[PDB]
């Protein structure tokens, strides 16, 4: 919307997000980057697992799970999006290899913008009478792509250069963090509120619930079939796992008239707390096999 | 705000024609117009829908492959083309407009139609 | 794939200065995107009642709207001459829009 309430909301956003991905740029490396570019193994096992079998999945869930073509088609809008920035702290959440990490990221991100198109074009034949094509939002992409790799190279050169600073900067990053992470919470908490409860059909929320589940599986099965260690595992199932959400809400809002969105309304939201919660559960799991094994 | 409709008239089976609905007072690309249908004796039918700045259409389940709605920017106008017509399609055809969201209350959501056209009047006999 | 929507009183016979009441039923939840139309022999549609609730401009006190879950009332506080018509039950939530089998209001005697 144009709102005050929402310009302020994506303003406060990007701080976060900004502040975030600099304090986590710390563990990052240029060798090892260099390195995961030069022999590109478990990013090529990201980029299948994400443009290959996802999309699949979500047209089969589309199809087994009775849904409306609204409802399918944003499933499937879902099942198409880079991995976004949450992956990066559910990587870091857990021991993970983090260059890889990053790398995932900037490579799925710039290659959604020749890789999405097709894949909407290829699979939207049925549930949506137009062209999806042009609604992709790239210019939108290509500043997320930049936002992202802004704060890594400071933090990068931070740590190379003045070591000195960087507990302040630290410490910096973790308290705006927490003072944008409340306001973000008080508007979207006024907003959803002071809004009407849309409905929601049951089945959707049995979709958008076992969607990042079946992501995290099989990223984790993927990369067993092909000999691995832990810590890429681990990243490339969080990767896997992980969608951009806002790209999805995007291109609902600009493809659907305010008086169709309305079963749509609360899905994006919805989907965002399902992947937090279902991330969570794992990390947990994990860190208690590591202490009790 | 006014609709007028046009282009009613006999035509043969599985043959076509095409419907069209100048409006005035309003922008046709902006705004939603949507064609309902009453066969003689019959209760109302919906159609298809046109949203042309959303690039969004959508049809009815009877209707979906055979008809072809689309919009005019530059006459203004809205129009419906329908293929291969059946002798169940024979009925007086309506224009109607969506409700217009208002800026300044963001929440409400108005559902409804405001408002119809006279109406044109079409026959599939051989 | 359409959501059915039954009006069950088909035809009602009322007198002047009565009260009227139309139900419809939705076989899903539809929210509050219902709407209310009157129609005359010969003529185009008019909307009364928008989002199961609101009364439109122009359109007299009389008529009134009313959501219970699935379930939306349309009612006529006093019957007049000119209220004898044909009344639809329409949503418009989901994609496939679809209509009430109708409601004729006649002349009691």
């Known amino acids: 919307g144009k709102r005050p309430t929402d310009l302020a909301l994506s303003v406060i956003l990007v701080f976060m997000l900004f502040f975030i991905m600099l304090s986590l740029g710390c563990t990052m490396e240029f060798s090892k980057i260099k390195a995961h570019l030069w022999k590109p193994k478990g990013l090529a096992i990201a980029l299948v697992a994400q443009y290959g079998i996802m999309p699949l999945t979500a047209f089969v869930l589309g199809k087994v799970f009775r849904l409306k073509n609204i409802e399918a088609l944003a499933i499937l809008v879902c099942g198409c999006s880079p991995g976004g920035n949450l992956s990066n702290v559910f990587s870091l959440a857990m021991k993970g290899d983090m260059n890889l990490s990053i790398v995932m990221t900037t490579c799925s991100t710039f290659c959604a913008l020749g890789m999405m198109p097709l894949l909407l074009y290829i699979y939207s034949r049925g549930i949506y009478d137009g062209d999806l094509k042009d609604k992709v939002p790239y210019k939108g992409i290509v500043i997320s792509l930049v936002l992202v790799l802004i704060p890594c190279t400071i933090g990068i050169v931070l740590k190379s250069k003045r070591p000195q600073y960087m507990r302040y900067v630290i410490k910096g990053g973790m308290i705006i963090i927490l003072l944008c992470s409340v306001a973000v919470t008080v508007l979207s908490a006024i907003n959803v509120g002071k809004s009407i409860m849309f409905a929601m059909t049951p089945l959707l929320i049995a979709t958008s619930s076992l969607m990042p589940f079946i992501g995290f599986l099989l990223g984790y099965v993927l990369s067993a079939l092909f000999c691995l260690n832990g810590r890429c595992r681990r990243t490339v199932s969080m990767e896997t796992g992980c969608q951009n959400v806002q790209l999805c809400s995007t291109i609902l809002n600009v493809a659907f008239p305010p008086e169709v969105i309305g079963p749509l309304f609360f899905f994006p939201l919805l989907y965002m707390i399902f992947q937090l919660g279902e991330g969570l559960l794992l990390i947990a799991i994990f860190w208690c096999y590591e202490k009790f094994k | 705000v006014q609709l007028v409709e046009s282009g009613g008239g006999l035509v043969q089976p599985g043959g076509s024609l095409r419907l069209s609905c100048a409006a005035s007072?309003?922008?046709?690309?902006?705004?939603?117009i949507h064609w309902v249908r009453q066969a003689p004796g019959k209760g109302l039918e919906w159609v298809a829908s046109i949203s042309s700045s959303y690039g969004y259409t959508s049809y009815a389940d009877s209707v979906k492959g055979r008809f072809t709605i689309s919009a005019d920017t530059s006459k203004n106008t809205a129009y419906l083309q329908m293929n291969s017509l059946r002798a169940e399609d024979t009925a007086v055809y309506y224009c109607?407009?969506?409700?217009?969201?208002?800026?300044?209350?963001?929440?409400?959501?108005?559902?409804?139609?405001?408002?119809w056209g006279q109406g044109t009047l079409v026959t599939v006999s051989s | 794939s359409d959501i059915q929507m039954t009006q069950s009183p088909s035809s009602l016979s009322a007198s002047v200065g009565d009260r009227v009441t139309i139900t419809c039923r939705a076989s899903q939840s539809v929210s509050s995107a219902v709407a209310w139309y009157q129609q005359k022999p010969g003529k185009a549609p008019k909307l009364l009642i928008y989002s199961a609730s609101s009364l439109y401009s122009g359109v007299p006190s009389r008529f009134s709207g009313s959501r219970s879950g699935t379930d939306f009332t349309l009612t006529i506080s006093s019957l007049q001459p000119e209220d004898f018509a044909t009344y639809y039950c329409?949503?418009?939530?989901?994609?496939?829009?679809?209509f009430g089998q109708g409601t004729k209001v006649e002349i009691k005697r």
């Open positions: 109607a407009r969506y409700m217009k969201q208002q800026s300044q209350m963001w929440y409400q959501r108005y559902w409804g139609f405001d408002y």
């Open positions: 007072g309003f922008n046709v690309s902006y705004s939603s």
């Open positions: 329409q949503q418009s939530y989901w994609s496939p829009i679809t």
